[PDB]
Design a binder for this molecule. Structure first.
Ligand SMILES: C[S@@H](CCCN)C[C@H]1O[C@@H](n2cnc3c(N)ncnc32)[C@H](O)[C@@H]1O
Ligand SMILES: C[S@@H](CCCN)C[C@H]1O[C@@H](n2cnc3c(N)ncnc32)[C@H](O)[C@@H]1O
Ligand SMILES: Cc1ccc(N)cc1
Ligand SMILES: Cc1ccc(N)cc1
Lengths: 281, 281
């Protein structure tokens, strides 16, 4: 049995590996190298440009926090946009909300969706939902053109190297701000506090140039580098994204595996050194 | 340049690796394989039985939380025991407290101490402190014999495979309970919630057989498996270890890099699935 190893200049000097039960599918799409394998212990795994995007074992942590942090703070979210997110995990979580009337997903790589419909049927099951509409395009362009505004935008992107490069700059955050309702929120994947402080400071400074409250939360998830990933959390009101406005009690949420009301606000209590780095931005 | 890889049956199907700048020292001690290397990006690294024990980059997270969670809850801790902990990181953190009069450390492997005094001078600097006393012995035996009781016991052990095997059983938790003052506390390293749920349930059930409050906290630290490690948190009073009783404001604590008053209680807000697994113990 072979192992998959995740090496990158974005985390020099370190690497995480998973043992491979069987390779299921590989291709070069228009944008990226796509790999799907059944791991021995983390179930099926999706890899893009040699970087792990999800595993069936842990995806609920990242999908649940990126979705339910903002969707419990937004009072009556009607219209939601997922940027990236072709696997459908964020959509799945979104569909549990009966009040949502529309979910747009802008994913640059349709291969990611199709692979997910084929190989990840419990992650991609929300594409059957009549409220979901799919747009295959660079979100940087989608957001320059979309006429609707959203109650929430969830930026479920890959890393800055690759097609997500257009998503980690001051310009993209202007577009997001413009595309949100006046009391709308955006959460975005915003890397690891252990090694990406320069990036975190940059993104925070980008968000703070527009949003009146910018917060950063941290998720434990073992298959992203350093075992955590942050949520850059952008609020147009002074009040922010640290306190949920509801609890998830209907039968659709009985299945939740990470998110709950308390660990929502916990995620925002950050390490001392991180607070000190970002305090003068 | 070579890489160090951390493979183990304790986390089958996964592995973390660090790139090696230079090997500094290796030996087989009486108890374990000892490796010290300068990594390219995480500074110097100490490895025991092929398992990473610490790196200079991140050790403050684990040392600060394991120390300051209980030392801010204990009102006037006079006498403290570190189990394991030969690197001295816990001692270092302990020494900052002027009120502490004595620190006993029971470390089974004196090689770990000596290597740490030689190679990790900013971790091991607390051994110069006149209040520190060192005992080279199996803590399982030390705690069967010690006549003093402690205000806090910090169990800074390696994993259950190896000499720490004696530290992860119902018997060891009885000894700890006996060795603590009536309002004394114990925190112990208690593995990763992503893969060690069976162990976490076992340890919790062990602790709950004696202690009236048993809590579990989680730390982000990239160089332990799954990027987190838990703190099993044992309180003889109903009140527990989730809320600090003081803030660390004197000049000795200006240097803190992870711990603070808020992220102390945050660490105890756990993922949904973990709460459900442990609810009927
Ligand atoms: C699969 S997903 C994240 C894994 C956990 N849901 C990351 C997606 O972001 C897409 N991505 C990357 N850059 C962009 C842009 N610029 N636009 C839209 N989608 C993008 C990429 O193709 C992945 O499918
Ligand atoms: C270096 S330390 C942890 C790394 C972060 N401080 C873990 C120590 O626990 C010791 N250890 C393991 N088992 C025992 C027992 N049974 N007793 C005392 N110390 C032990 C082991 O030799 C390490 O030095
Ligand atoms: C969603 C996501 C987060 C981090 C990395 N590295 C890739 C993907
Ligand atoms: C302290 C410590 C925690 C976890 C592992 N794996 C080793 C050492």
């Amino acid at each position: 049995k072979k192992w998959f190893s995740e090496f990158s200049i974005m985390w020099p000097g370190q690497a995480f590996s998973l043992k491979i039960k069987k390779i299921l599918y590989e291709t070069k799409s228009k944008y990226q190298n796509v790999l799907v394998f059944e791991s021995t212990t983390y179930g099926k795994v999706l890899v893009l440009d040699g970087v792990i995007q999800l595993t069936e074992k842990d995806e609920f942590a990242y999908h649940e926090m990126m979705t339910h942090v903002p969707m419990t703070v937004s009072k009556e979210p009607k219209n939601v946009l997922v940027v990236g997110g072709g696997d459908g995990g964020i959509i799945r979580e979104l569909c549990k909300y009966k009040s949502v009337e529309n979910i747009d997903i802008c994913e640059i790589d349709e291969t990611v969706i199709e692979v997910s419909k084929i190989y990840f049927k419990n992650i991609s099951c929300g594409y059957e939902d009549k409220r979901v509409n799919v747009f295959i395009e660079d979100a940087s362009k989608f957001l320059e053109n979309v006429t609707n505004t959203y109650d929430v935008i969830i930026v479920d992107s890959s890393d800055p190297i690759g097609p997500a490069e257009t998503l980690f700059n001051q310009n993209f955050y202007e577009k997001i701000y413009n595309a949100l309702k006046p009391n709308g929120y955006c959460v975005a994947q915003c890397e690891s506090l252990w090694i990406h402080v320069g990036t975190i400071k940059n993104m925070i400074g980008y968000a703070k140039k527009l949003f009146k409250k910018v917060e950063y939360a941290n998720i434990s998830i073992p298959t992203y580098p350093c075992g955590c990933i942050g949520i850059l959390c952008c609020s147009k009101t002074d009040t922010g994204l640290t306190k949920p406005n509801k609890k998830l009690e209907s039968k659709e949420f009985a299945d939740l595996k990470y998110y709950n009301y308390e660990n929502h606000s916990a995620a925002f209590k950050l390490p001392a050194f991180l607070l000190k780095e970002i305090e003068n931005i």
